[PDB]
Amino acid sequence: PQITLWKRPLVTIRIGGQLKEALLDTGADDTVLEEMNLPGKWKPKMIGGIGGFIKVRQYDQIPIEICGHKAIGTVLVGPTPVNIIGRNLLTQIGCTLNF
Amino acid sequence: PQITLWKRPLVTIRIGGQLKEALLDTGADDTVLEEMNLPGKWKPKMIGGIGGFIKVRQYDQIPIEICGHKAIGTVLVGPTPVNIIGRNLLTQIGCTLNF
Numbered sequence: 109p110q111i112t113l114w115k116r117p118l119v120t121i122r123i124g125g126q127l128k129e130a131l132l133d134t135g136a137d138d139t140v141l142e143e144m145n146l147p148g149k150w151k152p153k154m155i156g157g158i159g160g161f162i163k164v165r166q167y168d169q170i171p172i173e174i175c176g177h178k179a180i181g182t183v184l185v186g187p188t189p190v191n192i193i194g195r196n197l198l199t200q201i202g203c204t205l206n207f
Numbered sequence: 208p209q210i211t212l213w214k215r216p217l218v219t220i221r222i223g224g225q226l227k228e229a230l231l232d233t234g235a236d237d238t239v240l241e242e243m244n245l246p247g248k249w250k251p252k253m254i255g256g257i258g259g260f261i262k263v264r265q266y267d268q269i270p271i272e273i274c275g276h277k278a279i280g281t282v283l284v285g286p287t288p289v290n291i292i293g294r295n296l297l298t299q300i301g302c303t304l305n306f
């Protein structure tokens with residue numbers, strides 16, 4: 109598909125038995141999801157943006173379905189105001205910018 | 208161009224005869240540049256990102272040539288971690304996400 113940018117590029121993602129709306133975000137190196145109690149090992153991390161840093165938990169090799177496309181990789185979980193699909197997963201679903 | 212996402216989508220912009228590097232950022236509503244001088248009137252504004260809220264200076268109707276494509280619109284100047292081109296100008300240059 110082609111997604112124009114008149115509005116926020118929100119799409120449906122699935123992680124386990126949670127469907128969420130998330131931004132397809134070319135400005136995000138990593139994928140950042142709102143607080144959720146995922147199973148498995150994790151490591152603490154700090155990530156920064158406008159307004160400063162937040163603390164997140166880094167979970168590796170997490171399968172995520174994005175608009176019906178399968179992805180698997182690192183997801184950061186913490187008190188983000190919005191679910192963010194970053195480049196690590198955008199590449200896996202074949203996403204490009206075009207103009 | 209078609210821009211893949213294995214690397215940050217950084218592009219050269221021309222703003223006021225100055226060349227800068229900026230990140231094409233679909234997760235940003237607004238275009239936010241690091242501290243710089245721009246001519247004309249501006250308005251104080253606040254914007255929120257992943258880490259909280261910041262104060263910026265809002266300049267309206269500013270020309271920017273983004274990777275060879277002309278835009279004229281609102282530019283926010285303030286303590287963003289990197290220069291970002293947001294949807295307000297990505298739309299002007301006909302940028303879409305495709306997968």
Ligand SMILES: COc1ccc(S(=O)(=O)N(CC(C)C)C[C@@H](O)[C@H](Cc2ccccc2)NC(=O)c2cccc(O)c2)cc1
Pocket residue numbers: 133135136137138139140155156157158189190192194230232233234235236237238239254255256257258288289291293
């Ligand atoms: C290392 O991985 C990451 C590091 C940083 C980020 S990031 O989120 O700070 N961030 C990194 C960049 C700032 C370099 C990604 C952005 O697209 C961010 C996404 C967004 C949207 C709404 C609310 C919060 C955040 N947008 C914004 O900050 C934003 C949102 C709305 C209006 C506005 O003026 C700016 C993401 C991933």
